[PDB]
Amino acid sequence: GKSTTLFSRHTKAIVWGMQTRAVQGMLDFDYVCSRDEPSVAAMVYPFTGDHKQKFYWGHKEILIPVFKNMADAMRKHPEVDVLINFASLRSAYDSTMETMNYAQIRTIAIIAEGIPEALTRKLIKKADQKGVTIIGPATVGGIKPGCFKIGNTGGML
Amino acid sequence: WARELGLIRKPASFMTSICDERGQELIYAGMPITEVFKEEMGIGGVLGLLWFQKRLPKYSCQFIEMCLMVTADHGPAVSGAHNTIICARAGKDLVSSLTSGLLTIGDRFGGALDAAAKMFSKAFDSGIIPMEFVNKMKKEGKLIMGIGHRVKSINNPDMRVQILKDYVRQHFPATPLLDYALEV
Amino acid sequence: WARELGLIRKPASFMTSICDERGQELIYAGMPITEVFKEEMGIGGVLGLLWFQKRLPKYSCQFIEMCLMVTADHGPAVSGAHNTIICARAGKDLVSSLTSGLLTIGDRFGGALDAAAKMFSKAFDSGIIPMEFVNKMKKEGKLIMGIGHRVKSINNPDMRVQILKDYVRQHFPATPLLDYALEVEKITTSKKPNLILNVAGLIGVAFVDMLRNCGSFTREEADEYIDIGALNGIFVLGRSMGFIGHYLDQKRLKQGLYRHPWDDISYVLPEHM
Amino acid sequence: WARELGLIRKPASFMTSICDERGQELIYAGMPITEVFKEEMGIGGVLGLLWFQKRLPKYSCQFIEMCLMVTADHGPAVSGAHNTIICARAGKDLVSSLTSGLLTIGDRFGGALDAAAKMFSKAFDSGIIPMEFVNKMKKEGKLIMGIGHRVKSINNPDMRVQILKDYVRQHFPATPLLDYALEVEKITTSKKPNLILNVAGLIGVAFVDMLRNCGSFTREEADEYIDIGALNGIFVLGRSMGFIGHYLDQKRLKQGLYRHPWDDISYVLPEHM
Ligand SMILES: CC(=O)SCCNC(=O)CCNC(=O)[C@H](O)C(C)(C)COP(=O)(O)OP(=O)(O)OC[C@H]1O[C@@H](n2cnc3c(N)ncnc32)[C@H](O)[C@@H]1OP(=O)(O)O
Ligand SMILES: CC(=O)SCCNC(=O)CCNC(=O)[C@H](O)C(C)(C)COP(=O)(O)OP(=O)(O)OC[C@H]1O[C@@H](n2cnc3c(N)ncnc32)[C@H](O)[C@@H]1OP(=O)(O)O
Ligand SMILES: CC(=O)SCCNC(=O)CCNC(=O)[C@H](O)C(C)(C)COP(=O)(O)OP(=O)(O)OC[C@H]1O[C@@H](n2cnc3c(N)ncnc32)[C@H](O)[C@@H]1OP(=O)(O)O
Ligand SMILES: O=C([O-])CC(=O)C(=O)O
Ligand SMILES: O=C([O-])CC(=O)C(=O)O
Ligand SMILES: O=C([O-])CC(=O)C(=O)O
């Protein structure tokens, strides 16, 4: 089943891809929303080893883990309930299919444009089977003022 | 005196085949220095003689010279130039500063040459098509070495790749690996 | 002025956790230098603080000091000491000569520490018995790192392996990898006498045992420190003393520029290239 | 075979007097390694044997150990630590990174030890009073090496100068050059408070005092060892610990390749050459 409240002030998201500007904008949005914790718990980038990337929490300096594989990211962060996918039209399908293998993810945001309609229909079918809400591809995402922000929605700070 | 008479045996502990300092004339891998200068090779010819012990064609030596020219410097922001400048501003030495800068040449900095060459040679020798090579690199979590730029993409190319590529196209007899890399 | 007011944001490009130069007092990994000297640690304690950010026990620091002492020098015939002497006889510099000598520290020279430690750690973690480890090394065309000596075999041991081994036996709480290496040494000495645990192999296994047997490190931390080359640093720091001593000896003896004799070099240049 | 029979003559091309690798036991400047460990010296004793070929007293070796401890590291902002970190973040090597950091040790960075020692030794041997030395340095356009600090002046001293100075006062038999340097320090602090004896200057004067005040060395030997750069080796060996610690820290933190920001570099290239 698909829930009604996709995002809250405690929502934790995993970002697929090396998008430092989008994650920093998300963190700035969280800080100006008086959130207790950043909305991004970890990042997934398959073309590098696991490490820590440096980000800003207001003026404080924080570290966000970056994992090569989805499995490690979901293992170390069971509190993550949202995936924001910054994969290309040639990788969004496989990454979303791999993500829907983890039950903790209830909402998936796909930013890529140009995905074939058949692959998108397969994604929709699997999401409906798993009860996972998908913000359709070729979108900036969404904004919930005070709770959560997806990707680059709403521009800069 | 015993060695001159051939009375004793002492094996040589070192081997060399690139330069013969002894004798009436200096020799670069079997070639006299006067003959080196008369044949009108430059840095490329001497480099070929000293590194490969081969008499390279004129276009090969010129291409080596172009490769040395285009890799001469890339600003002070790179790790090696930064280290050289740090050691120079300490007033240490020319040799020490250049050495400190060169010690950063390795995998992350200055190693894209050998890494790209090895990757493309392995791909070409494996017999896989460029699309198969790209897919294999993608599924292995590896980025293709020697592919990708920061600002210059198309209709505004490197201006260092273009000159070398034009020289290779005009002068090299056959460029199979270059064509494979261009398809990639 | 803008940073003081907190008006702008500029991320720091560097990270450090081993030394705090700023402030009223110098700090070594969270410990003041005055407290460092009051706790009566020496080179071993400062090395532990700077390299592992840990307050090592007294026996661990003393063992690190012994490891530095035994790897201080091994004569001028080794590649590193030879290069240091060559650069010193050219009248270059202390730093340049020591650096030229240290640049030979690698796989063939000075790398038996880390190689032996990694091999024995992999064998011990794989769960294979020492005989199985010896057979696996033999069938893979690999020689066991840290095993084998030139003259000293038995009834006349290294006299550097013995001191460190006695210290480790008396002071280390548990030495599983050292016992595994000693069983491997027994098996290798059952083949030919000079196949004993080297100073490099003994130091490697005892350093792994110290890392993963003291309460300072978890298993992951010890494995990471072994992987990143802590024993390479141990050997380099130990041998730097001998390299500087060699430079000072060559500058005191006032030795001239060295040139290798031509009779010792075989010239195999091609006929004409 | 001909050399064994004594039939031929071949002069040796190298000389060494600090370590004897051949034989049944390793020897450090005439002393067996087992006897080295039984006499209970540490890094200081082995350093003295390898660098000066002398059996130094216990306090001299301990003072050498303290000098190595206090020069271990001074943060990552110095040129050498910066270069070591740059080479480490390039993922090159432990040896390469430490070497790149050490290659900055010279006149401007890490040479205040030898420079201060030489200046104070020349002043003391010239027979001039400390005030005359200060005036001579002032009129020559030269700043006194080893004098001056950044924040710590008085009622808040170095906390590294204090420990070494207390040890030298308690344990050294005679400290003429240290007293001369302290009078110079009083004169300089009479000008502005932060003109105190630096760690470099204090270590230099105390090392000269140890060399020419212990019974191991004659005056000529101490002068020669100061001239050839024994304190340069002291500083390099001390700071190598911090450089290796910085390399290990950077490899543990898994820092990527560094590239200097363009906004921090001023480009003054000519119009067209
Ligand atoms: C030696 C060579 O020719 S490069 C060989 C490198 N090896 C490879 O080819 C492996 C595969 N390629 C890759 O790794 C990647 O595709 C790269 C690194 C080549 C592509 O570069 P990117 O990932 O875009 O990072 P890049 O180096 O461009 O840096 C990003 C930006 O910082 C800027 N920048 C670069 N150096 C500096 C500096 N010192 N200070 C400030 N800004 C800088 C660039 O202008 C660049 O501009 P952008 O914002 O428009 O992208
Ligand atoms: C750092 C260390 O403690 S050593 C670590 C080395 N790494 C390993 O342990 C890997 C496994 N071990 C091995 O590779 C081998 O078992 C070795 C090299 C350790 C054993 O040594 P060997 O193969 O016997 O060669 P070795 O070094 O003894 O040299 C042979 C002889 O030359 C002599 N020799 C050594 N150095 C010199 C020199 N500079 N000049 C002249 N003769 C020399 C030796 O006395 C030795 O005597 P021998 O004829 O009685 O054997
Ligand atoms: C190895 C040693 O012990 S020191 C070497 C010995 N050399 C000598 O003694 C030679 C003679 N002495 C001198 O040259 C001078 O008297 C000095 C350099 C020792 C005195 O230092 P100063 O001239 O005051 O310059 P200093 O190094 O303090 O730098 C100035 C300020 O920058 C600050 N600063 C130092 N390093 C950094 C850094 N990496 N980043 C930002 N700020 C820094 C300092 O806190 C200092 O504080 P201040 O503003 O209160 O003065
Ligand atoms: O040349 C480039 O584009 C990459 C670079 O900075 C270098 O290694 O010189
Ligand atoms: O110590 C040994 O026996 C091996 C050696 O020569 C060295 O690397 O120092
Ligand atoms: O120690 C000091 O005060 C000066 C310094 O930065 C160094 O060379 O280590």
Distance CA B130, CA B184 (A): 5
Angstrom CA distances, C62 to A130, B159, C163, C181, stand at 60, 60, 13, 22
- Listed in sequence order, the residues at least 6 apart from D47 whose beta carbon sits closer than 8 Å to its beta carbon are C241, C245, D61, D64, D68, D237
Neighbours of C100 (CB within 10 A): 24
Residues of chain C neighbouring D78 (CB-CB closer than 8 A):
21
Q: How far is CA A41 from the centre of its chain?
A: 9
Distance CA D46, CA D34 (A): 12
Single-letter code of the amino acid located at D40: E
Nearest chain D residue to A51 by CA distance is D254
Numbered residues of chain C with Cβ closer than 8 Å to any chain A Cβ: 6, 9, 11-12
D102 within 8 A of D239, measured Cβ to Cβ? yes
For residue D7, the SS3 value is coil
Distance between C270 CA and the closest CA of chain B, angstroms: 5
Distance CA A16, CA A110 (A): 10
For tokens 């199979």, name the residue.
B176
The reply to whether ligand 2 has any atom less than 6 angstroms from the CB of C56 is no
Tokens representing residue B140 in the block: 């292995």
The reply to whether ligand 4 has any atom less than 6 angstroms from the CB of B74 is yes
Tokens representing residue D75 in the block: 């943060």
Distance CA C1, CA C23 (A): 20
The reply to whether ligand 4 has any atom less than 6 angstroms from the CB of B78 is yes
In ligand 1, which atom is closest to the CA atom of B113? 1
- Choice from D262, D263, D264, D267 to test ligand 1 binding pocket (greatest atom count within 8 A of CB): D262
In ligand 4, which atom is closest to the CA atom of B112? 8
Q: Which residues pair with B121 in a beta bridge?
A: none
Pairing, β A107-110 against β A60-67: unpaired
What subunits touch chain B, counting only 3 or more CB pairs under 8 A? A, C, D
Neighbours of A3 (CB within 10 A): 11
Based on the number of CB atoms within 10 Å of its own CB, is A36 exposed (0-12), middle (13-18) or buried (19 or more)? exposed
Based on the number of CB atoms within 10 Å of its own CB, is B103 exposed (0-12), middle (13-18) or buried (19 or more)? buried
Single-letter code of the amino acid located at D80: G
Nearest to C242 among D19, D76, D242 (CB): D19
Maximal CA-CA distance, chain D: 75
Distance CA B76, CA B55 (A): 36
Tokens representing residue A56 in the block: 């800003």
E strand or H helix at D177, and its extent? helix D176-189
Based on the number of CB atoms within 10 Å of its own CB, is C6 exposed (0-12), middle (13-18) or buried (19 or more)? exposed
Tokens representing residue C215 in the block: 């309460």
Q: How far is CA A16 from the centre of its chain?
A: 7
Numbered residues of chain A with Cβ closer than 8 Å to any chain C Cβ: 54, 56, 59, 61
Broken C–N links (> 2.5 Å) in chain C, after residues: none
Which residue, judged by its Cα, is nearest atom 49 of ligand 1?
B150
From the list A105, A91, A107, A87, the residue with the least C-alpha distance to A16 is A87
Distance CA D100, CA B99 (A): 8
- Listed in sequence order, the residues at least 6 apart from B20 whose beta carbon sits closer than 8 Å to its beta carbon are B26, B27, B30, C267, C269
Distance between A59 CA and the closest CA of chain D, angstroms: 21
For tokens 């094996």, name the residue.
B11
Q: Which ligand is nearest to the CA of B110?
A: 4
DSSP tag of B149: -
Q: Is B151 on the interface with D (CB under 8 A)?
A: no
Q: How far is CA A121 from the centre of its chain?
A: 21
| Alpha-carbon torsion, ordered C171, C174, C178, C183, to 10 deg | 120
Distance CA D175, CA D60 (A): 13
C91 within 8 A of C97, measured Cβ to Cβ? no
The reply to whether ligand 3 has any atom less than 6 angstroms from the CB of D71 is no
Tokens representing residue A4 in the block: 């009604």
What subunits touch chain C, counting only 3 or more CB pairs under 8 A? A, B, D
E strand or H helix at D138, and its extent? helix D130-139
In ligand 4, which atom is closest to the CA atom of B149? 3
For residue B172, the SS3 value is coil
HSE value, Cβ hemisphere, 13 Å, CA-based, for A26: 29
Q: Sign (positive/negative) of CA torsion C11, C12, C17, C19?
A: negative
φ and ψ of B52, to 5 deg: -120, -5
For residue D31, the SS3 value is strand
For tokens 């040890």, name the residue.
D167
φ and ψ of D198, to 5 deg: -75, 170
The reply to whether ligand 3 has any atom less than 6 angstroms from the CB of D146 is yes
Distance CA C54, CA D160 (A): 21
Distance CA B134, CA B139 (A): 9
From the list C103, D267, C106, the residue with the least C-alpha distance to B100 is C103
From the list D82, D70, D50, the residue with the least C-alpha distance to D204 is D70
Distance CA C229, CA B95 (A): 28
Pairing, β B19-20 against β B27-28: antiparallel
Single-letter code of the amino acid located at D229: G
Neighbours of C94 (CB within 10 A): 25
D35 within 8 A of D23, measured Cβ to Cβ? no
E strand or H helix at B139, and its extent? helix B130-139
Which residue, judged by its Cα, is nearest atom 51 of ligand 2?
C150
Nearest to C252 among D74, D94, D228 (CB): D228
C91 CA → ligand 4 middle, Å: 36
Q: Which residues pair with A52 in a beta bridge?
A: A65
Residues of chain B neighbouring C272 (CB-CB closer than 8 A):
30-31
Distance CA C212, CA C230 (A): 13
Experimental determination approach used: cryo-EM
Distance CA A92, CA A100 (A): 12
B103 within 8 A of D87, measured Cβ to Cβ? yes
For the stretch D263-271, contacts whose Cβ atoms lie closer than 8 Å and that sit 24 or more positions apart, written own/partner, are: D265/B75, D265/B76, D265/B77
The string over D47-86, giving b where at least 16 C-beta atoms fall within 10 Å of a residue's C-beta and e elsewhere, is bbbbbbbbbbbebbbbbbbbbbbbbbbbbbebbbbbbbbb
Nearest-Å Rg of the Cα atoms of chain D is 23
The reply to whether ligand 3 has any atom less than 6 angstroms from the CB of D81 is no
D72 within 8 A of D197, measured Cβ to Cβ? no
From the list B73, B75, B74, B183, the residue with the least C-alpha distance to B129 is B183
Reduce the secondary structure of chain C to three states and give it as a string. Answer: CCCCCCCCCCCCCCCCCCEECCCCCCEECCEEHHHHHHCCCCHHHHHHHHHHCCCCCHHHHHHHHHHHHHCCCCCCCCHHHHHHHHHHHCCCCHHHHHHHHHCCCCCCCCCHHHHHHHHHHHHHHHCCCHHHHHHHHHHCCCCCCCECCCCCCCCCCCCCHHHHHHHHHHHCCCCHHHHHHHHHHHHHHCCCCCCCECHHHHHHHHHHHHHHHCCCCCHHHHHHHHHHCHHHHHHHHHHHHHHHHHHHHHHHHCCCCCCCCHHHEEECCCCCC
Based on the number of CB atoms within 10 Å of its own CB, is C17 exposed (0-12), middle (13-18) or buried (19 or more)? middle
Q: Sign (positive/negative) of CA torsion D258, C239, C83, C270?
A: negative
C160 CA → ligand 6 middle, Å: 37
Distance CA B27, CA B18 (A): 8
Strand order in the sheet with B27-28: B19-20, B27-28, B31-32
From the list A96, A79, A90, the residue with the least C-alpha distance to A132 is A96
Residues of chain B neighbouring C266 (CB-CB closer than 8 A):
12, 14-16
Nearest chain C residue to B96 by CA distance is C96
For tokens 């293992």, name the residue.
A75
Tokens representing residue A19 in the block: 């998008």
D231 within 8 A of D203, measured Cβ to Cβ? yes
- Concatenate the DSSP letters of all residues of A6-24 into one string: ---TT-EEEEES--HHHHH
Distance CA C246, CA D19 (A): 9
Q: Sign (positive/negative) of CA torsion D158, D163, D166, D171?
A: negative
Distance CA C41, CA C54 (A): 13
Angstrom CA distances, B92 to B83, B98, C88, D71, stand at 12, 10, 17, 20
C74 CA → ligand 5 middle, Å: 6
DSSP tag of D254: T
Q: Sign (positive/negative) of CA torsion D263, D264, D268, D273?
A: negative
HSE value, Cβ hemisphere, 13 Å, CA-based, for B119: 19
Nearest chain A residue to B142 by CA distance is A47
- Listed in sequence order, the residues at least 6 apart from C192 whose beta carbon sits closer than 8 Å to its beta carbon are none
C93 within 8 A of C99, measured Cβ to Cβ? no
Distance between B106 CA and the closest CA of chain D, angstroms: 6
For residue D132, the SS3 value is helix
Residues of chain D neighbouring A51 (CB-CB closer than 8 A):
254, 256
- Concatenate the DSSP letters of all residues of A56-110 into one string: EETTEEEEEEEESSHHHHHHH-TTEEEEEE---TTTHHHHHHHHTTSTT--EEEE
Distance CA B11, CA B118 (A): 37
- Listed in sequence order, the residues at least 6 apart from C174 whose beta carbon sits closer than 8 Å to its beta carbon are C209, C213
C262 within 8 A of B22, measured Cβ to Cβ? yes
From the list B181, B183, B182, the residue with the least C-alpha distance to B117 is B181
Mutate to test the interface with C, among D150, D249, D263 (most CBs of C within 10 A): D249
Distance CA C127, CA C123 (A): 7
Q: How far is CA C40 from the centre of its chain?
A: 24
Nearest chain C residue to D19 by CA distance is C75
B113 within 8 A of B105, measured Cβ to Cβ? no
In ligand 2, which atom is closest to the CA atom of C150? 28
